[PDB]
Amino acid sequence: SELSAIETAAAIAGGSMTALEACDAAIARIEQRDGPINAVVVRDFDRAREAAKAADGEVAAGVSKPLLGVPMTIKESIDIAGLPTSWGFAEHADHIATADSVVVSRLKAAGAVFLGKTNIPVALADWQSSNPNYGRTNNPHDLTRSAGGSSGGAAAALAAGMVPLEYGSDIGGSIRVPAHFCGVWGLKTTFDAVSLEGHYLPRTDGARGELGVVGPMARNPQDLALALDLTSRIALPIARIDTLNGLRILLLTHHPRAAADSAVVAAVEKAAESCAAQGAQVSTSNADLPDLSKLVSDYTRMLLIVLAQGKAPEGTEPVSLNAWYGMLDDQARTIRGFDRLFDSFDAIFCPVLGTSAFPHSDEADWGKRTLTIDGADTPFGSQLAWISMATYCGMPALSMPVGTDANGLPIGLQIITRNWSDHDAVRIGALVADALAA
Template identity: 45%
Template sequence: MSETLSLDLLDRTAGEIVAALAAGQASALDLTDAAIARIEDRDRAINAVVVRDFGRARQAARAADVALARGERTPLLGLPMTVKESNEVEGLPSTWGSPAFSGWVAPRDAVAVARLKAAGAIILGKTNVPPFLADWQSTNPVYGRTKNPWDLGLSPGGSSGGSAAALAAGMTPLEFGSDIGGSIRVPAAFCGVYGHKPSYGLVPTRGHAPPGLDGGPIALAVVGPLARSAADLDLALGVVAGPEPHEAKAYALNLPPPRHAELADYRVLVLDQHPAAATDHEIRDALDALARRLDDLGARVDRSSDLLPDLAAQHAVFSALVGAAMSRGSPGGTTMNAHEWMNTLDAQVMFCRRWAVLFASFDVVITPTFGVVAFEHVDEPDGARRILNIDGQATPYFNQIAWPGVALLPNLPATAAPIGFTRGGLPIGAQIIGPYLEDRTTIAFARLLEREFGGFKAPPALT
């Protein structure tokens, strides 16, 4: 097979690549070699794939070719891909962007990584993150700075910024990240790709923890896929979702199908304002345009509802919960006594119930993923002193966690999808929030938007 054909295949969706491999149009080894060559070429400027495992990837590709020749077929057989650095991959370092963990090597695969491999995926390496996954940039003292393929002077987002940058730059057709404060959805929006935050607990998080820790699930935290198409999100979710192995002996996952097959049948609530976070007018304009187009197609589109939970009150509960979850072990971290923690969890349950009531009348809620598009790299070490300029006003940097938090506190699925571009040509993303455990509805809605209005476009420098 020609090198040109292998490179062309890399720009197709993961599902199309798997189908091409199954049809004998390419070999897994040739495709893996092409992916490696592209990483070595394009990543010099971007610095997204910071842990490389090319030798073992080639071995896995040879094994995949043997399996393909035997007629074996699995959902990702022969597909080269990367995963976020914080996901444990046996034999590879996992530092979470901190020098304190330099030299730590994972003794086993994370549950989700093991499922990707069992489905036939070939792990090329791991992608960059900020220290302790606590930023919407992907810069750290271990691996350096990852840059946005749309503009090297801009952040690719975080904490799965290396994931989104590698996807947008065509270095990988599929990625696997994590999200506790927008870490899948914000990078997807900044780089113009797709990302899915699963319903809490849908995908096991074991093997995604600071090095050396192996305890229970972290409140709010999820792991999930990023891709260049909504269909690939569904493909990957089907591979990784399901109970922990020790629980699977008692029950199996049976996700409900999407609520509807056409956009015209959806009941949609579109929100563009949050009491805790400002939103740039170009993002609000893009959401307005999307709402009008959905209305023109026959969907029922509302811009407000009395059923919407109090977002300010919800954000206060979310801030307490995420503060405790993210700062565990830090000297100045958020602390609360056991009864305060229980009261916070009770408040979380109340909001989960309110959202369930709303989703009896609506199918999806569309909001900004973040209040701005990709911003210039920020080097200010003190997060409290960082600002984002939104429509000429200086706003606190971390206020923006409010938009990702809309779906996080009530444990809801949320799919990030590109919906347009700024006048300056940068991607604009939205998040599609759906009912708990109805992940296939939000992904299907994103897929319908992609069909009707278009989806991922490669950055100009790469076309």
């Protein structure tokens, strides 16, 4: 493959290459590779090479920083000063951000260089990345399939080797699902651990909502861990895990509210037997597991209120504030349920989604889509079940590649750890990957 973000940084810091050559190589890969993929839909190449020269002025003057001169892109829905943030809305094509987002400001502070931004579905509301401003992003592994969404272009740029680092957002699996579909690494972070300032509905500038998070995306866990330390509000607890021996794993290949294809089950199951072969204690049932079906209903109820900003259609009565406060009480009760579960487990292993990447759908209404699972059509939206646990209850959740299905399409494993243990999620993935090579 290509240089990782850390390897790029270290090459720039040893002499092997200049930030501006690094920036020009990335530009080269994007132009040579993005034609059929359409992942880098906002390009800031001229300014990017200026800041690359600026980065080289620093290196020539003794300066070092963990990402100095490292080229990267970011999800279109995160503000970069001077660049559109439209979220795919035609009405906001020309909404130009005035201020870097906090994530961007943080990575810029660490010396990174921003070449542009990556494609998203309209309103960040799909497991595909398609919109009238930029068009559609195609899975580098099979151009007839979805790149995932809403962070789909991010994952596709990573998978195609264009840039070593990205940063996405997830309120309904939009980091994990595209990483899963495209065969790269994506970390949904603990709720409220990373600032969403600059991840603004276009032309707004308010408070972060419940549920949603931003987190990094990369080709490897080392880059994720570094990107996390550079962007979290405060420094998060370092990884306590340094071996799979004795690691306690809750393996969930069933969900009461969604099916999984047998290839996906096999992939996740194999990742767990592989860990076991290194000492892990793998369980398949526990009485402290919260009601996953009630969880899906509570999460969905709250997801639709959040996305609608508390509004309801004409004739329909909105939720009262007090009822909303009751919904947060419910959410807190469920969260305590997982606190008790993590007294007995270090991680949950489960699918990210019940299928690998599906063929492009032009059907806007999820209720009219299907997904083929084990040869039969099943409801498309049911699959939110798999990503509901970590979003609703706040936990960090890694999506990492662990296999390919029979058509060559990536399959990812979801690793859920306890709140604030984001670095243990990443570290356990790193160890799953060693174990599967063994």
